[PDB]
Amino acid sequence: AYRILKPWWDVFTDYISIVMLMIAVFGGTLQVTQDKMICLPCKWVTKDSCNDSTGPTGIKYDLDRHQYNYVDAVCYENRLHWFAKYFPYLVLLHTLIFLACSNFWFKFPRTSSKLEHFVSILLKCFDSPWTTRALSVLDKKEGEQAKALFEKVKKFRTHVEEGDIVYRLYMRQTIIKVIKFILIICYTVYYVHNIKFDVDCTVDIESLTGYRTYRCAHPLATLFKILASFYISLVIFYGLICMYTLWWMLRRSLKKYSFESIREESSYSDIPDVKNDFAFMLHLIDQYDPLYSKRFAVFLSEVSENKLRQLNLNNEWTLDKLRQRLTKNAQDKLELHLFMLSGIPDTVFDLVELEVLKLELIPDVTIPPSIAQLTGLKELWLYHTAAKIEAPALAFLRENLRALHIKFTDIKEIPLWIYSLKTLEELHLTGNLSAENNRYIVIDGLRELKRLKVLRLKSNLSKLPQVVTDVGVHLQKLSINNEGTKLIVLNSLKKMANLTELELIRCDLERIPHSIFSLHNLQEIDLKDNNLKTIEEIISFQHLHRLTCLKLWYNHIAYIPIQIGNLTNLERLYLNRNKIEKIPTQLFYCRKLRYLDLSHNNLTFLPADIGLLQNLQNLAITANRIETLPPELFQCRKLRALHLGNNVLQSLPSRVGELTNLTQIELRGNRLECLPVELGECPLLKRSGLVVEEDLFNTLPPEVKERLWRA
């Protein structure tokens, strides 16, 4: 109950008060039963006092028994000192006041309720299993019980640390006790010498008895003196204890607890100093047993909160949910996207078929060694997430990881240990690498990443790093994305010789780098969104021989150079989204063209030389002002797909019958009214495959419509 609160001084004062109550009860009983004064008249009186002046004979006073009783009563009422007459009652009153002052805060509803809440919460935290676990690995019920206790502690903290009504009240009680003690000793010491046995009396009742002065004798005086002295000593001890209590409560700020020891002893350095009222209760409970404060300490810490949260996530995210959370990616690779789960669950490491551990805004992951259990991990994909892997897991990752995708905002965010990786081949960086001159100090780790094969720089580099040019001896792909930042080639690509795919995306070259031509093993080149106006330099590509795909996804090219005719080995030109007015036959002198993307341009007509090409598979002239489609294009076979969108009023030739290899085709955005029946002649044409407006779909013969539908 409240025994745990009571310090040693409170127990001592309580027992002293019980002893004083015993004294008061004994004195009251004595006064009630045997308190009387025996009085005898004095025959010879001088100066209002007794002069004291055969065998001896008695002195006859000639007084009745009642006359004696009456003089006794009168002398006792008027001459006996009040202290000797009401001593036990004063002691009882003082003891009752002391007891009321000591037990007032336990009955005042506000402080009593607050301390009841405090003691209940303290006991429920003390007897919890989580605290004993904390000072010293998975359980379910204790987790939610502990999290509930943690929450209750939080609520109590806000409800009590607000203001001091318990500290303030206790402070007062002590002051009142001290001042009472002072007064009791002062008045009692002053008036303790008036308790005398022999009491001289003069009451002027001559008319009733005949004697003026009497020599009374209070037989209870000596015992009252003994009781008064013993009570004085008890009050002295009580006052000394109260003085110590007052000194203890005014030597240090009890309103400010510390919780420093546990914070700097048993880890849990996240225990803050509690404010007023709560701090007073903690200091008060320290007197009984310091272990209680340590038990309460673990529930006021943040690291304990994250440990419990982990254990909860451990129970919460069971493998079955994670197995459901498992997905497959574009590359048919099993993916598990972790989307702000505070800390990564421990259960996923038990899973074995995972391949993607994409993490995103999950602070302080600190990859556990249990990752060695999982074997299918190749790609890891840190996204705005710190990481501090442990040594064995670091070694295992060094021996197993294949792909890494680092995304971040701040430069330091990039972990150091990633450079210790030795079996890395795919590396992608997202987030500004610019260190504002004297850069690349972080990036220098790529020197030891000699096994790297493909690298990505989405970081707005004004200049290409020297580190990447050094490491590019064995490298294959530079997927560089500047998001509008102008990149200076500075002939540095000339170092790269084993390189085979290059992509300067949104790098705003405005011109061909003129250094790419030095490379002799390039096969796929991509210049997307770089404001290319005139691109004649593409003639230099005739020097290259491994080239198979020229990509110009977005630019402002106006006139296509005729010198393309020299190019022969290219296959998959994608020059869509450009200000191309017309296409010359010079592109068509090439014969190895597999894929063509003459779409989203200002083309007006199609030369018959498209049909001259005999290796085309997929074509697209979408969003072009194509008034008429030449029938000669239909000579070309092996046309798996053929895009026609947002075109002009046209008329599809019946020669579509010679499209046996057609599988997909669009006829939208162009003014058409009669789709030829020979469309059904196509053997691999599906209802969904042919994308046309519904009405044009209706213009077909009904049986042909059925044939397309069943496909």
Next chain:
Amino acid sequence: AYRILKPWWDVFTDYISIVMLMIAVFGGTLQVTQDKMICLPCKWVTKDSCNDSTGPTGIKYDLDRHQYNYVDAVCYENRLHWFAKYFPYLVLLHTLIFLACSNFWFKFPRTSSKLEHFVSILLKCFDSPWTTRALSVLDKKEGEQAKALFEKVKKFRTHVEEGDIVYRLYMRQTIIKVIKFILIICYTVYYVHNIKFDVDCTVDIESLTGYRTYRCAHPLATLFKILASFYISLVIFYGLICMYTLWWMLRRSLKKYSFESIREESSYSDIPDVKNDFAFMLHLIDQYDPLYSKRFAVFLSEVSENKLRQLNLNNEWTLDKLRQRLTKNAQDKLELHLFMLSGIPDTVFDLVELEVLKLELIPDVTIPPSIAQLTGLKELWLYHTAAKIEAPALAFLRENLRALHIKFTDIKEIPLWIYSLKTLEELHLTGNLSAENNRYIVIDGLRELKRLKVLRLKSNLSKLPQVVTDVGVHLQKLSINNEGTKLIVLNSLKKMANLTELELIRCDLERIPHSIFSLHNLQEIDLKDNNLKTIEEIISFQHLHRLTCLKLWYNHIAYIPIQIGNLTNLERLYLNRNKIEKIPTQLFYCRKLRYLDLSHNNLTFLPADIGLLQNLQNLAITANRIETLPPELFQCRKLRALHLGNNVLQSLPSRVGELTNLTQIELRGNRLECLPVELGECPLLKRSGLVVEEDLFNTLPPEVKERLWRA
């Protein structure tokens, strides 16, 4: 609660104190209700006192009742001994002091809290099920609560054994009680003869009564004498008991318990000696019942925890669980991956069928000699685990262990006794054994082994330890995986004349070492991923007459030297993932070739001399630029597998039907349009053999498709 704490002497003293309280109450009520002195004047007196000097007649004293009362009160207050008047109060005070000094430690907060903690711990551990189990199974949840109780015991030990407050308080308590008994006896024996019936009194109040000397009679004197004598006897008994307690607490030392009895009664020799306070509290419990102490020494034990915890691992990890873990490895051998288990389970030592024992991240493992049961074990794995081991286990390893795997994060993880092995033949060490600033001292132990023939190593070694060449006398299977670091042979390889199989994985030589040439015993050679450009040194390879597999892949080989034609006994040649552009006929003159691979190269033409390769059984041109297949390839009847996908091939000659031995051909990512029917001619061919797109499969006739589906 406190009943167990109280020994017999405490109970006896408490009952004695109750009896003295009864004495005090009786004396107090008697002295309050019939304590009065009856006094009569002495008419004839000589030297004060009372001289003792027709029918008898009463003596007339001429005193009224009130004068008698006055003289009674006066001679009671003045001429009555204080002991006779205050004997019940003195005995009441003494009994209160004795009770307070007997129950002082039950109210002082520090000692009371420590005693309550000890009582709760003893009561909990006394009802613990594991006590019985230990005193002599583990159950489901009793085991974890038992663990908690063991852990709580540890916290209580660390909390209470640092001080000696309880022992000092009991010392002072007994000392003070003994002093009080001595003082009580000394003062009461001296002042007990003054309690008398006849009390002569002279008070000099003649001026009020007329008589000088009186003879009084205290009627309560005899009863008070009897009570005083009985109380003196009670105090004598109390003091004797207190002196016995003092002698018991002074004999031997109460701050040093032993627990030796149990350490011999039920093994558990681990139980140490408890210190101050903890020892005192236990001694008292022994004085109550030694059984309680014995049923708690179990938790104080350490092997008891190891037992409960190791058997708790049995709860987690039974023999049946190991049967589930039993898995065939790459060497179709039963293995067990103990993924940071708390410790090696005992049941694991009961699978004679086990032969591959993997220990992974299992801390502080101490291998027990029960390995004697395990005879089938031939090879074991040591990942991230330092293993302490016992001498019979060393012996068993000495005549039974065949191969050893070790991977270490740091040098100290490597056990020293591993070199004490003699029958060991394989050691595939992995870690950071480079030992910077430590040269290669750890490897020195290797010299001890003499039967080793496999020394796989991957620790980014800079140089080669000379102990390696020392063991090279019997070493024949040397594996070095420098993992991206450079190594020099430094003519050391010429020393190991018995070496017959060499590879430098990721050792980055950029040059064929000359040391290997002088050695004639080699048969398998790999220079995987060493950034090799020119390989003309293969001319010296003609001096070799046992080489049958030159595998050179993941390199930048461009030109194949003519000296290839010189060597003849080559059987397997892996040149894939290189920069080869032309295929010289010098490899074609060779007839012994059976396994050939030129995948991931810059090859567009296959010479017809492929026909003169009848020994070929598997060929790979995967991911290349060849678009015409030489028909002479089909002359190699022994050929049974082709890897020719991801090419620009567009025609399969019908002669493919002549390959009866053929089993598997993949053609995905190839420019084929009409897949020939002669493929169905192959008898061993199966649907799984044809890894080809479903469209080309449908290009097959329905009977051919049916045959493939049948397989």
